[PDB]
From Swiss-Prot, chain A:
Function (record text): Required for pre-mRNA splicing as component of the activated spliceosome. Plays an important role in embryonic brain development; this function does not require proline isomerization.
Gene name, Swiss-Prot/TrEMBL: CDC40
Subunit composition and interactions: Component of the pre-catalytic and catalytic spliceosome complexes. Component of the postcatalytic spliceosome P complex. Interacts with PPIL1; this interaction leads to CDC40 isomerization.
Protein name: Pre-mRNA-processing factor 17
Record's comment on post-translational modification: The reaction is catalyzed by PPIL1.
Span within the parent record: 465 to 579 of 579
Cellular compartment(s): Nucleus; Nucleus speckle
WD repeats, residue ranges: 1-34, 40-81, 84-114
Disease: Pontocerebellar hypoplasia 15: A form of pontocerebellar hypoplasia, a disorder characterized by structural defects of the pons and cerebellum, evident upon brain imaging. PCH15 is a severe autosomal recessive form characterized by progressive microcephaly, and poor or absent psychomotor development with severely impaired intellectual development apparent from birth. Other features may include spastic quadriplegia, early-onset seizures, and chronic anemia and thrombocytopenia.
From Swiss-Prot, chain B:
Lineage of producing organism: Eukaryota, Metazoa, Chordata, Craniata, Vertebrata
Tissue note: Widely expressed. Highly expressed in testis. Not detected in brain and lung.
Protein purpose: Involved in pre-mRNA splicing process. As a component of the minor spliceosome, involved in the splicing of U12-type introns in pre-mRNAs.
Disulfide cross-links: none
UniProt protein name: Crooked neck-like protein 1
Curated annotation (Swiss-Prot), chain C:
Residues of the full protein shown: 166 to 201 of 802
Family: Belongs to the CEF1 family.
Lineage of the species this protein comes from: Eukaryota, Metazoa, Chordata, Craniata, Vertebrata
Domain of life: Eukaryota
Known tissue expression: Ubiquitously expressed in both fetal and adult tissues.
Protein name: Cell division cycle 5-like protein
Subcellular location: Nucleus; Nucleus speckle; Cytoplasm
Physiological role: DNA-binding protein involved in cell cycle control. May act as a transcription activator. Plays a role in pre-mRNA splicing as core component of precatalytic, catalytic and postcatalytic spliceosomal complexes. Component of the PRP19-CDC5L complex that forms an integral part of the spliceosome and is required for activating pre-mRNA splicing. The PRP19-CDC5L complex may also play a role in the response to DNA damage (DDR). As a component of the minor spliceosome, involved in the splicing of U12-type introns in pre-mRNAs.
Signal peptide annotation: none
UniProt PTM: Phosphorylated on serine and threonine residues. Has no effect on subcellular location nor on homodimerization. Phosphorylated in vitro by CDK2. Phosphorylation enhances interaction with PPP1R8.
Disease / disorder: A chromosomal aberration involving CDC5L is found in multicystic renal dysplasia. Translocation t(6;19)(p21;q13.1) with USF2.
Gene: CDC5L
Transmembrane segments: none
Organism expressing this protein natively: Homo sapiens (Human)
Length: 115, 125, 36
């Protein structure tokens, strides 16, 4: 559903509707990095907008289950899983110039900032 | 408990409804429907259930019995007394009705009421 | 007759199961579609 370029411009991180996010090298030969495969979402049927913080250390991800997941994009694992929205949590956008800011839109009609 | 449980309820309810739809005579299905309800603790449901069953067969001692047994186990004691007097009004020559009425009245303490219901009772010698 | 109907006494439940497990995971995924 969704593809976001890492603010380093090295990776296209595309939320694959197989419930997980896949990273590819966007600068090198269409390589799928299976060492960068973010696990634990449910994206089949939803377009979860996932993003990257500016330090390339953190990734933010949405699930339709109300789950805001805050992952350490290096360790490939999430460090937080909380209530983002009630309806389909569509946009989970990391702010590039703010450290804590994760702004979420969704089918819920309420537009949140989290910090 | 959102919808797996709720749909299990929906199923069992639809079943009991179809079984009593087929027969609506012999009562075991009426009872089992109702006691399933009471075990799920919806006594408004179970109440309407026993009224309908009592409609189709108001000469069933076991129906009257377990109706009032529900009411007593849930101590809507006023409701229970209404049940018991209606019973002993329509099926007087049944004795266990009179009995359970008194016994429950006794552990309720209203022995003035117990006396007068025994006066009632003896009017039938 | 008798024993056949015993066989679908379960394999029916798998259907609501495979309806449940899909749809709970389905609708929680971000899509609240109703069958009709």
């Amino acid at each position: 559903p969704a593809v976001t370029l890492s603010p380093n411009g090295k990776w296209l991180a595309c939320q694959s509707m197989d419930n997980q996010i896949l990273i590819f090298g966007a600068q090198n030969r269409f390589r799928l990095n299976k060492k960068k495969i973010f696990k634990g979402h449910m994206v089949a049927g939803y377009a979860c907008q996932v993003d990257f913080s500016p330090d390339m250390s953190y990734v933010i991800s949405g699930d339709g289950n109300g789950k805001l997941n805050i992952w350490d994009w290096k360790t490939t694992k999430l460090y937080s899983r909380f209530k983002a929205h009630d309806k389909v949590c569509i946009g989970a956008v990391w702010h590039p110039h703010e450290t804590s800011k994760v702004i979420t839109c969704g089918w819920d009609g309420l537009i949140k900032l989290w910090d | 408990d959102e919808e797996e449980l709720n749909d299990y309820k929906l199923r069992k309810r639809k079943t009991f409804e179809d079984n009593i739809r087929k027969n609506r005579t012999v009562i075991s299905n009426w009872i089992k429907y109702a006691q399933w309800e009471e075990s799920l603790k919806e006594i408004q449901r179970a109440r309407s259930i026993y009224e309908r069953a009592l409609d189709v067969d108001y000469r069933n001692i076991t129906l009257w019995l377990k109706y009032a047994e529900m009411e007593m186990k849930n101590r809507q004691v006023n409701h229970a007394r209404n049940i018991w007097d209606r019973a002993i009004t329509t099926l007087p020559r049944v004795n266990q009705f009179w009995y359970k009425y008194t016994y429950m009245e006794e552990m309720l303490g209203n022995v003035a009421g117990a006396r007068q219901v025994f006066e009632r009772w003896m009017e039938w010698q | 007759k008798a024993k056949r109907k015993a066989r679908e006494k379960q394999l029916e439940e798998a259907r609501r199961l495979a309806a449940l497990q899909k749809r709970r995971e389905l609708r929680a995924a971000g899509i609240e579609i109703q069958k009709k």
